[PDB]
C-alpha cells in the first residue's frame, strides 16, 4: 500500500486508539517523543501514554467523546504538555480524529515536538509584559493604519481597549473635536507622512477630559526597502507637564525649608492633587524603626483599589523612608504613577537629607543666626559649669509677647527686624557677669551668679523696663512687654533649674503676661511682704510715726559734752522694730527716700529750735545723710529749707556727707553744698579719698568733723594692725586740726586704748545709749561729766 | 492493514510525490486543503499545487534536493503562503519528510493551517518593534532571578545581548567597583526584593564606564497569585543623576542663604558641570529690564551655537527673569535641555522671589539678621550724625578674610557660624565707646573714635591676637586672620572715609594675605618708622648702651646733698636724642619693661660701687622704677639681685612706687616691700597713698620721704593743698623721722614759697641741674650749700 512506507517513515507521531481505549500503533516519530518504545505499549492500555496524574481525568474526557462524541465532534488540534519516559512533561501539539477502523469506533491521535515554537511563545509571553510595562503609549500600524497591538498604557491613558482599538484608524478611535476645524487635517498629514514625524493633537478620552497630546509616528521598512510598519507613540504633554510642574512645585516648597512632617504633608498634598482618586503617606525610619511620617485628610477608602511602594535612600545606605501611595483602579495610568512615585521619592530622600543635615547643626551650632547671640548648645555648657562649681546659678526665662501684630501686619521681613532691636538693647543694657542665650523664638535665657533678693529685684526689672518705648518700625511704633520668670535654687539640676523657669514663664502668660515672678511661692511671698511693707513706710511718712534718738557726744578728756547723733528709728505694731540695716534699702527700692530724709532733717531742725527757744542748749547735732544717699539735686534745697523754717544757726549743726567721695560721678554736689559752710553748718567725712591723693584731701572742702567708723574701733583693741591707723588717723586730725569722733566703744578696755592716742571724741554704749526724745533732756540735765 | 486507514482517512493535509515530480498519494485533507480532487491530481506535476509566481524554481529545488543530497536532512517545517485551486492564497503550516519506495527518492508533505498563528507571529514582530522602538531598556527575569530577555536600548547601553546574558544572575551579569558605596549588597538585595521597588547602581560597560542606573524592579502574578515573572526597567539616571546632584546642591545653598551673586554663581557651576562648555547666562528683570545676574566664565567662541531660553517667573507668573542658555550646536539632547531649564529655572525662580524681597527691604532694614550686627543703613546714619557732629572716626574695616578656606571646605552654614564666633570676639573684647557693624558679605567694620597712633596700632595689633587663635568649630579649627584698613581725616564724609578704608583693605589684602595698614601712605610710614625704633631700642638695650644721669635733692634745711636721683637716658646718633617721656611708653610698647628697669638698678648698683672708693659717701639713691612700671613677675629677687653685686647695704637704696599701681594686685605686692625693708632698700611713695591710708603707714614701712610731683609743685598757684600735704608729712615726720621731697623747684621765689612751709628737702633745676654721670664730685666739693 502507498500508506505503508509514509506512515512508516513520517516525522510526525502517529497512534490509534480503539474504540476500548487500547492502543495498536506507533512510530519513530512517536518514540522520539514520550519516550517508550513501540512493543511496551503496543496493545497496551492508553492510561500508560495519558500522564500519570492526568489519568484520574481521563476517563472523564473518554466517556464524553465515547457515549456522546463530545456532542458528535471528530476531533481538533491544540497544545498539550507531554510528560515524556524520561518525566520530563514537554510542550508538543496534538491533534485527535474519530475513525472507523475496522468498522468500530477508533480513535487516532497525531503529535508534533512543538519545544522551538514554545519557546517563541515564551519570547511573546515576556515580550507582552515588555509591552503593557513601559513608560509611554506605543501602538504599530500596517500598511492600512489600522490599530494592531497596543499597551496597558494606553488603555489606561484614553479609556480604550484592544478590542475596542483593533483594526480601526487612530482618528476614528479617538474621534477628535471639531474645534479647531484643522485637527482633522493635521492628522491626517501626520499619519499618512510617511517619513518619521511629529505633531500636537488634541484628543478627548472616551471618559472624558481633554489631553494636549504629542503624538510621534516612525516608519520600519523591511528587506525589500518597502513600508513594512509604522510606529506611532502618544507622549502625554499635559499630565507629563503636570508631573513637571509638581517636581517643580515640590522643589520650590522645599526650598524654603520648612519642617519635617510639613514637608511630609506637602508631598503627599501635592501627590493627591495630581494623582486623585488616591491617597498617599510617606514614613520616616528612626532608630532602625518606621514612623508615620505625613498624610493628607483625604484618608477615605477607594474600592477596587492598589498599593503602591517606593523606597526612599539618600546619598547612600539603608532606606531613610517608606514611600505608599494607594490608587483607585481607573485613576490614573500606570506609567503616570511610575512618573509621580520616582520625583516623589527623589524629593523624599532630598527631604530626609535636609532634616538629617539640620540635626548636626542645630545641635553643634553655637550662635543662634538670627541676632547673633547663644543658644541652647551654649547655655547648657555655661549653666553646666556653674552648676558643677556648686556657684549658685540664677536661670531667668525671658517672653516676648504682644508680637504677633508686627508679623501680621508688616510680615516676618519686619518682624524679625522688631526682634533683632530689642536683643540688641538686651545686649546694650547687660554686664559683664551676666550671659545672654536664646533658645527658641521669642524665648531668652539670661544666667546670673549674683543672687540676693534685692538684686533680682532689680535685674528683672531692667530686663522688663527694656520694652519701655515702642519699637519703631517704618516709622512708626509697635509695642511689645516681656514674662520674665526667674529660677533661683540650689543643688537642683539645670534641667530642674530650666524646667522651673519655663514653668513660670508660661504661667505669666497664662496669666496675661506684661510681667515678672519668681518660681517659688514662698520667694514670692517675700516680695508680697516687702510691697507691704513699702506701701506702709509711705503711709508712716504720710503720718509722721517715725522718731528721732540721740546718742550723747563727750569730750574724751574733759568729760564735756561735745554734740548728738539723729539715728532713725522705726517703730510699728505690725512688724516691730525694723532696723536702719533694713528699712533704708526698702525707701531706696519703693522711692521715697527723698520724703524719708526730708521729714528727718526737718524734725531735726524743729527740735534743735524748740529747744533752744526752752531754757536748754546743746552743742550741735549730726544727721547722717549718706546713710539714705540723700544724692539728689535737692540735696542743699531740703535742708536749706528745712533750716529757714527756723532760722539758720548752722554753727549749732553737722552734717555728714560719706558719700565715697561724693565727687567721683556728680561735682554739682560739691559744686552747690558751699552754702552750707557759708551758713555755718559743720562739715564731716568718714572715708578716705583715693584719686589725685582724695582732691589733696580737699583742703578747701571745710571739713570738721572725722569719724572713725564702728568696725575700725571695735576690731582695733587686739590688733596693731588697726591701732596704727587710728594713730595715723588721730594724729593727721590733731595736725591738719580737725575734730575726731569715734563711732564705737564698749568697754573701759576700749576706751583705755583709745585715750592715750588723744581721741577728741568717744561714743558708743560706754557713754550713753541712745536716748529718746523725752527723756534725753532728763539725761543732760542730771550727769555732766560721766567720768 | 491499519495502514492503509492510518493516512488514508486522516484529517491532517497529506500529500505525496514520487521521482517524476508525480502526485502519488493525495489525502482527503489535501483535497480539502487545496481543493482539487484526488483524480484530478494523482499524476500531475507538483507544480500545479505551488503557486503560479513560485512555480518555475520549484522543479528546481526538487533537483537540487535530489542531486546534492543536503546532509541527507530526514525533513524540516515551516510556514508557507499556500495557493488554493481558485487562486486564493492562504498561510498554512507543513513539513516535508523524506520518504524512498522502490529504492527511489520520495517526498511527503505534511500540512496544517495554524493562521491565528500566522496572525501571532505578526503580533509578535509588532511586539518585537514596539519595544523596541523606543529607547527605555525592559528585560524579564525568571523566577530565580536570571535575566531572560533583552532589548534594543538595553544591549545598547551595556553591550551584553540576550545572547551572552540569558541564564545568569543580574549581579554577575553587572559589574560594580569595589565597593565604593557598598553597591554590591544593595544590588544583591534589590535584586532579591519580591515587592516592586526601585534603587540606583553603578554599572561598568564592558569597556568599563562609571553610569548610574535606576533599576526599578516590578513583579507579575499569573492568574493564580503566584510569583510569575520579574520585569525590570534601567531608566539611564545620568542626566537625571546630574539634576538630582544639581537640586541637592542647589538646595543645600538657598538653604543657607548665601549672597546673591554668591547664589548665581553656583547655579552656574553647576549648570557648566551638567553642560560643559556652556555660555549659560541668568538675565534677571530689575525695573523692567534684562540685568546680567551671573554667567559662565566658559564664554569662548562657538560656531553657530545652540541658543535656548527659559523663563523665571514669579508665584502669580509674571516674568522676573530668563536663563539663557548657550552650547555648542545641537550637542545637547532636547529630553534633558528641556529639563536643566524647567528645574534650573524654576528653582532659581525662590531665589529670585527672596531676592525682589530683601531688594525691597533693602533700602529700609537696619539690622543684618546673619550677625546681629548693624547693618549699612544703622552704620550710614551713625557716621552722618558724627560727621555733623564734627566727630572724625576712625573706621577699622575688618576685613574677616581667609573665609574661603571654611567656604569650600565645610560651606555657608558653618562659614556664618564661623562669622558668628569671630564677631564674639569682637563683640566680648570691643570696649563701650567703640562700635561695630556689617557694611557687606563678610567686610565688618568697627568704628571708633581714637586718633593716636599708638592707641590705633594697640587696637589693631590685639584684633589680629584675638583672632590669631584658631577658630574651632566642628572639631576642626581653621585659622583665621584679618586686614584691618584704617583712616582719620577731619571734615570728611562718610563716603570718603568708607571709600579710603575699603581701598586700604584691598590693598593690603593684594600686597599679602595678612596684616593691617591706613589709607594714604604718607602716614602709613609712621608704624614702620616707630617699629624700627623699637628694634633699636631692642639693640641699644640688649648692648648695654645706654646711660644715667644723678640729680642731687638739696635740703631746705641747713645741710649737705640729701641724696640723689637715678634717672634713665638714651643718646644715639641715627634715631636722635630720644627723651624718656617718648622711650618709655616705647618700652611698655615693646616689652622691655623689666629689662629696662633691670639694666637701671644694675647701673645704679655699679656707679653705687664706683662712687664709695672716693669721697663720695652716697647720702642716698633713689632708683625710681615707678614709671618703668615694675611687675610682680620680677621685682622681687631681680631687685634685690643688685644689692650683693658690690657691697651696698639698703640704708642708702631707695625704690619708689605709687599705691595706685599697688593697688592692682593687693595679694603679694608689699610682700617684697617688706623684703626690701630687711635689706633696708628705702621706698618712697608717690604723690599720696590711696583709699584707707593704712598700708602706707603699716606692714609697709614707706614715707622713708615721699615726693611731691613737679606739675604739682611749680603749679601750686592753683594747687595749694600740698600746703596741708607737706604739714601732714611733717605730722608722721616728726613722729618717726620721716621726710617730704618737693620737686620741680625753679626758683628762689619758689623756694621761699615752699620753705614757710616746713619742707625739708628742695629739687629741681634751681638749685642744681642734672649733671653727667662723673660731675658728682664736682658739684659735692662746690656747693656746700648755695641757699
Ligand atoms: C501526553 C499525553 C496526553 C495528554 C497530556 C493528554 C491530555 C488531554 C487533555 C487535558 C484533554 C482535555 C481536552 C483538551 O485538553 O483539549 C484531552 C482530551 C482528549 N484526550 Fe488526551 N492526553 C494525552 C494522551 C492521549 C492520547 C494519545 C489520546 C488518543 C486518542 C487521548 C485521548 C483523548 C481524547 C479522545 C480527547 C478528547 C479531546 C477532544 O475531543 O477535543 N489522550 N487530552
Ligand atoms: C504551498 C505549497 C508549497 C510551497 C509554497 C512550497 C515552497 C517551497 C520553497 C520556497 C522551497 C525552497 C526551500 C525552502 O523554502 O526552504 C521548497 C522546497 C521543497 N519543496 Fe516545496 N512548496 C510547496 C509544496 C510542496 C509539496 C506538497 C511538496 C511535497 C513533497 C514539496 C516538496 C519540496 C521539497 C522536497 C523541497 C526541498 C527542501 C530542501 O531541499 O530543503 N513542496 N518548497
Same mark, same amino acid.
Given at each position: 500500500?502507498?500508506?505503508?512506507? #509514509?506512515?512508516?517513515? !513520517?516525522?510526525?507521531?502517529?497512534?490509534?486508539?480503539?474504540?476500548?481505549?487500547?492502543?495498536?500503533?506507533?512510530?519513530?516519530?512517536?518514540?522520539?517523543?514520550?519516550? %517508550?518504545?513501540? +512493543?511496551?505499549?503496543?496493545?497496551?492500555?492508553?492510561?500508560?501514554?495519558?500522564?500519570?496524574?492526568?489519568?484520574?481525568?481521563?476517563?472523564?474526557?473518554?466517556?464524553?467523546?465515547?457515549?456522546?462524541?463530545?456532542?458528535?465532534?471528530?476531533?481538533?488540534?491544540?497544545?498539550?504538555?507531554?510528560?515524556?519516559?524520561?518525566?520530563?512533561?514537554?510542550?508538543?501539539?496534538?491533534?485527535? /480524529?474519530?475513525?472507523?477502523?475496522?468498522?468500530?469506533?477508533?480513535?487516532? #491521535?497525531?503529535?508534533?515536538?512543538?519545544?522551538?515554537?514554545?519557546?517563541?511563545?515564551?519570547?511573546?509571553?515576556?515580550?507582552?509584559?515588555?509591552?503593557?510595562?513601559?513608560?509611554?503609549?506605543?501602538?504599530?500600524?500596517?500598511?492600512?493604519?489600522?490599530?494592531?497591538?497596543?499597551?496597558?498604557?494606553?488603555?489606561?491613558?484614553?479609556?480604550?481597549?484592544?478590542?475596542?482599538?483593533?483594526?480601526? &484608524?487612530?482618528?476614528? $478611535?479617538?474621534?477628535?473635536?471639531?474645534?479647531?476645524?484643522?485637527?482633522?487635517?493635521?492628522?491626517?498629514?501626520?499619519?499618512?507622512?510617511?517619513?518619521?514625524?511629529?505633531? +500636537?493633537?488634541?484628543?478627548?478620552?472616551?471618559?472624558?477630559?481633554?489631553?494636549?497630546?504629542?503624538?510621534?509616528?516612525?516608519?520600519?521598512?523591511?528587506?525589500?526597502?518597502?513600508?513594512?510598519?509604522?510606529?506611532?507613540?502618544?507622549?502625554?504633554?499635559?499630565?507629563?507637564?503636570?508631573?513637571?510642574?509638581? +517636581?517643580?512645585?515640590?522643589?520650590?516648597?522645599?526650598?524654603?525649608?520648612?519642617?519635617?512632617?510639613?514637608?511630609?504633608?506637602?508631598?503627599?498634598?501635592?501627590?493627591?492633587?495630581?494623582?486623585?482618586? /488616591?491617597?498617599?503617606?510617606? *514614613?520616616? $525610619?528612626?532608630?532602625?524603626?518606621?514612623?508615620?511620617?505625613?498624610?493628607?485628610?483625604?484618608?477615605?477608602?477607594?474600592? !477596587? #483599589?492598589?498599593?503602591?511602594?517606593?523606597?526612599?535612600?539618600?546619598?547612600?545606605?539603608?532606606?531613610?523612608?517608606?514611600?505608599?501611595?494607594?490608587?483607585?483602579?481607573?485613576?490614573?495610568?500606570?506609567?503616570?504613577?511610575?512618573?509621580?512615585?520616582?520625583?516623589?521619592?527623589?524629593?523624599?530622600?532630598?527631604?530626609?537629607?535636609?532634616?538629617?543635615? @539640620?540635626?548636626?547643626?542645630?545641635?553643634?551650632?553655637?550662635?543662634?543666626?538670627?541676632?547673633?547671640?547663644?543658644?541652647?548648645?551654649?547655655?547648657?555648657? %555655661?549653666?553646666?559649669?556653674?552648676?558643677?562649681?556648686?556657684?549658685?546659678?540664677?536661670?531667668?526665662?525671658?517672653?516676648?509677647?504682644?508680637?504677633?501684630?508686627?508679623?501680621?501686619?508688616?510680615?516676618?521681613?519686619?518682624?524679625?527686624?522688631?526682634?533683632?532691636?530689642?536683643?540688641?538693647?538686651?545686649?546694650?543694657?547687660?554686664?559683664?557677669?551676666? %550671659?545672654?542665650?536664646?533658645?527658641?523664638?521669642?524665648?531668652?535665657?539670661?544666667?546670673?551668679?549674683?543672687?540676693?533678693?534685692?538684686?533680682?529685684?532689680?535685674?528683672?526689672?531692667?530686663?522688663?523696663?527694656?520694652?519701655?518705648?515702642?519699637?519703631?518700625?517704618?516709622?512708626?511704633? *509697635?509695642?511689645?512687654?516681656?514674662?520674665?520668670?526667674?529660677?533661683?535654687?540650689?543643688?537642683?539640676?539645670?534641667?530642674?533649674?530650666?524646667?522651673?523657669? =519655663?514653668?513660670?514663664?508660661?504661667?505669666?502668660?497664662?496669666?496675661?503676661?506684661?510681667?515678672?515672678?519668681?518660681?517659688?511661692?514662698?520667694?514670692?511671698?517675700?516680695?508680697?511682704?516687702?510691697?507691704?511693707?513699702? #506701701?506702709?513706710?509711705?503711709?508712716?511718712?504720710?503720718?509722721?510715726?517715725?522718731? $528721732?534718738?540721740?546718742?550723747?557726744?563727750?569730750?574724751?578728756?574733759?568729760?564735756?559734752?561735745?554734740?548728738?547723733?539723729?539715728?532713725?528709728?522705726?517703730?510699728?505694731?505690725?512688724?516691730?522694730?525694723?532696723?536702719?540695716?533694713?528699712?533704708?534699702?526698702?525707701?531706696?527700692?519703693?522711692?521715697?527716700?527723698?520724703?524719708?530724709?526730708?521729714?528727718?532733717?526737718?524734725?531735726?531742725?524743729?527740735?534743735?529750735?524748740?529747744?533752744?527757744?526752752?531754757?536748754? =542748749?546743746?552743742?550741735?547735732?549730726?544727721?547722717?545723710?549718706?546713710?539714705?544717699?540723700?544724692?539728689?539735686?535737692?540735696?542743699?534745697?531740703?535742708?536749706?529749707?528745712?533750716?529757714?523754717?527756723?532760722?539758720?544757726?548752722?554753727?549749732?549743726?553737722?552734717?555728714?556727707?560719706?558719700?565715697?567721695?561724693?565727687?567721683?560721678?556728680?561735682?554739682?554736689?560739691?559744686?552747690?553744698? &558751699?552754702?552750707?559752710?557759708?551758713?555755718?553748718?559743720?562739715?564731716?567725712?568718714?572715708?578716705?579719698?583715693?584719686?589725685?591723693?582724695?582732691?589733696?584731701?580737699?583742703?578747701?572742702?571745710?571739713?570738721?568733723?572725722?569719724?572713725?567708723?564702728?568696725?575700725?574701733?571695735?576690731?582695733?583693741?587686739?590688733?596693731?594692725?588697726?591701732?596704727?591707723?587710728?594713730?595715723?588717723?588721730?594724729?593727721?586730725?590733731?595736725?591738719?586740726?580737725?575734730?575726731?569722733?569715734?563711732?564705737?566703744?564698749?568697754?573701759?578696755? &576700749?576706751?583705755?586704748?583709745?585715750?592715750?592716742?588723744?581721741?577728741?571724741?568717744? &561714743?558708743?554704749?560706754? *557713754?550713753? @545709749?541712745?536716748?529718746?526724745?523725752?527723756?534725753?533732756?532728763?539725761?543732760?540735765?542730771?550727769?555732766?561729766?560721766?567720768?
Amino acid at each position: 500500500g502507498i500508506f505503508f512506507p #509514509a506512515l512508516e517513515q !513520517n516525522m510526525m507521531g502517529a497512534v490509534l486508539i480503539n474504540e476500548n481505549d487500547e492502543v495498536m500503533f506507533f512510530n519513530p516519530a512517536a518514540e522520539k517523543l514520550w519516550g %517508550y518504545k513501540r +512493543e511496551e505499549v503496543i496493545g497496551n492500555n492508553i492510561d500508560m501514554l495519558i500522564p500519570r496524574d492526568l489519568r484520574p481525568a481521563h476517563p472523564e474526557y473518554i466517556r464524553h467523546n465515547r457515549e456522546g462524541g463530545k456532542a458528535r465532534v471528530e476531533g481538533m488540534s491544540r497544545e498539550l504538555q507531554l510528560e515524556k519516559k524520561d518525566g520530563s512533561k514537554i510542550w508538543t501539539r496534538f491533534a485527535l /480524529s474519530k475513525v472507523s477502523a475496522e468498522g468500530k469506533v477508533y480513535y487516532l #491521535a497525531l503529535v508534533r515536538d512543538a519545544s522551538v515554537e514554545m519557546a517563541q511563545k515564551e519570547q511573546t509571553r515576556q515580550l507582552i509584559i515588555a509591552v503593557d510595562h513601559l513608560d509611554r503609549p506605543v501602538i504599530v500600524l500596517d500598511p492600512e493604519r489600522h490599530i494592531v497591538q497596543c499597551n496597558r498604557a494606553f488603555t489606561e491613558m484614553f479609556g480604550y481597549c484592544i478590542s475596542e482599538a483593533s483594526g480601526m &484608524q487612530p482618528d476614528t $478611535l479617538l474621534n477628535t473635536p471639531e474645534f479647531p476645524a484643522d485637527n482633522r487635517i493635521r492628522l491626517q498629514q501626520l499619519l499618512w507622512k510617511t517619513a518619521r514625524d511629529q505633531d +500636537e493633537f488634541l484628543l478627548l478620552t472616551r471618559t472624558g477630559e481633554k489631553i494636549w497630546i504629542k503624538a510621534s509616528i516612525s516608519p520600519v521598512y523591511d528587506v525589500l526597502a518597502h513600508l513594512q510598519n509604522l510606529v506611532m507613540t502618544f507622549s502625554d504633554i499635559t499630565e507629563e507637564r503636570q508631573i513637571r510642574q509638581l +517636581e517643580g512645585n515640590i522643589l520650590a516648597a522645599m526650598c524654603s525649608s520648612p519642617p519635617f512632617h510639613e514637608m511630609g504633608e506637602i508631598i503627599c498634598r501635592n501627590i493627591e492633587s495630581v494623582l486623585n482618586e /488616591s491617597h498617599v503617606s510617606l *514614613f520616616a $525610619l528612626r532608630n532602625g524603626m518606621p514612623i508615620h511620617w505625613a498624610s493628607s485628610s483625604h484618608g477615605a477608602e477607594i474600592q !477596587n #483599589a492598589q498599593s503602591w511602594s517606593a523606597t526612599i535612600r539618600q546619598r547612600d545606605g539603608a532606606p531613610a523612608g517608606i514611600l505608599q501611595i494607594k490608587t483607585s483602579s481607573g485613576a490614573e495610568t500606570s506609567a503616570f504613577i511610575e512618573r509621580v512615585a520616582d520625583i516623589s521619592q527623589h524629593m523624599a530622600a532630598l527631604a530626609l537629607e535636609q532634616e538629617k543635615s @539640620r540635626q548636626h547643626i542645630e545641635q553643634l551650632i553655637q550662635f543662634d543666626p538670627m541676632t547673633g547671640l547663644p543658644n541652647r548648645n551654649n547655655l547648657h555648657n %555655661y549653666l553646666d559649669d556653674l552648676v558643677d562649681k556648686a556657684v549658685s546659678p540664677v536661670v531667668y526665662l525671658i517672653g516676648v509677647d504682644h508680637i504677633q501684630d508686627v508679623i501680621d501686619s508688616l510680615g516676618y521681613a519686619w518682624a524679625d527686624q522688631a526682634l533683632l532691636e530689642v536683643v540688641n538693647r538686651f545686649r546694650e543694657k547687660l554686664k559683664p557677669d551676666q %550671659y545672654l542665650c536664646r533658645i527658641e523664638g521669642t524665648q531668652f535665657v539670661l544666667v546670673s551668679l549674683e543672687n540676693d533678693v534685692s538684686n533680682i529685684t532689680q535685674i528683672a526689672d531692667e530686663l522688663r523696663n527694656v520694652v519701655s518705648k515702642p519699637i519703631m518700625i517704618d516709622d512708626k511704633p *509697635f509695642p511689645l512687654t516681656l514674662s520674665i520668670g526667674i529660677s533661683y535654687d540650689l543643688g537642683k539640676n539645670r534641667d530642674y533649674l530650666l524646667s522651673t523657669a =519655663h514653668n513660670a514663664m508660661d504661667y505669666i502668660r497664662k496669666n496675661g503676661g506684661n510681667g515678672w515672678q519668681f518660681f517659688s511661692p514662698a520667694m514670692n511671698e517675700m516680695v508680697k511682704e516687702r510691697l507691704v511693707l513699702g #506701701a506702709a513706710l509711705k503711709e508712716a511718712i504720710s503720718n509722721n510715726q517715725l522718731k $528721732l534718738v540721740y546718742q550723747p557726744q563727750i569730750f574724751a578728756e574733759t568729760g564735756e559734752l561735745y554734740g548728738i547723733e539723729a539715728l532713725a528709728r522705726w517703730h510699728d505694731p505690725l512688724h516691730g522694730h525694723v532696723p536702719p540695716s533694713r528699712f533704708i534699702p526698702l525707701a531706696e527700692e519703693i522711692g521715697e527716700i527723698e520724703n524719708i530724709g526730708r521729714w528727718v532733717i526737718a524734725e531735726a531742725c524743729r527740735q534743735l529750735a524748740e529747744w533752744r527757744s526752752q531754757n536748754i =542748749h546743746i552743742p550741735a547735732l549730726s544727721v547722717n545723710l549718706s546713710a539714705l544717699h540723700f544724692r539728689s539735686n535737692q540735696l542743699p534745697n531740703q535742708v536749706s529749707d528745712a533750716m529757714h523754717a527756723w532760722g539758720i544757726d548752722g554753727h549749732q549743726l553737722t552734717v555728714e556727707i560719706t558719700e565715697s567721695m561724693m565727687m567721683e560721678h556728680d561735682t554739682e554736689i560739691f559744686k552747690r553744698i &558751699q552754702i552750707l559752710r557759708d551758713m555755718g553748718v559743720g562739715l564731716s567725712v568718714d572715708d578716705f579719698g583715693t584719686g589725685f591723693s582724695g582732691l589733696s584731701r580737699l583742703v578747701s572742702l571745710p571739713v570738721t568733723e572725722i569719724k572713725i567708723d564702728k568696725s575700725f574701733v571695735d576690731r582695733c583693741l587686739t590688733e596693731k594692725r588697726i591701732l596704727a591707723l587710728l594713730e595715723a588717723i588721730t594724729s593727721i586730725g590733731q595736725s591738719l586740726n580737725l575734730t575726731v569722733v569715734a563711732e564705737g566703744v564698749e568697754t573701759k578696755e &576700749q576706751f583705755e586704748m583709745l585715750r592715750k592716742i588723744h581721741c577728741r571724741v568717744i &561714743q558708743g554704749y560706754f *557713754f550713753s @545709749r541712745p536716748l529718746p526724745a523725752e527723756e534725753i533732756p532728763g539725761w543732760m540735765s542730771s550727769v555732766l561729766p560721766l567720768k
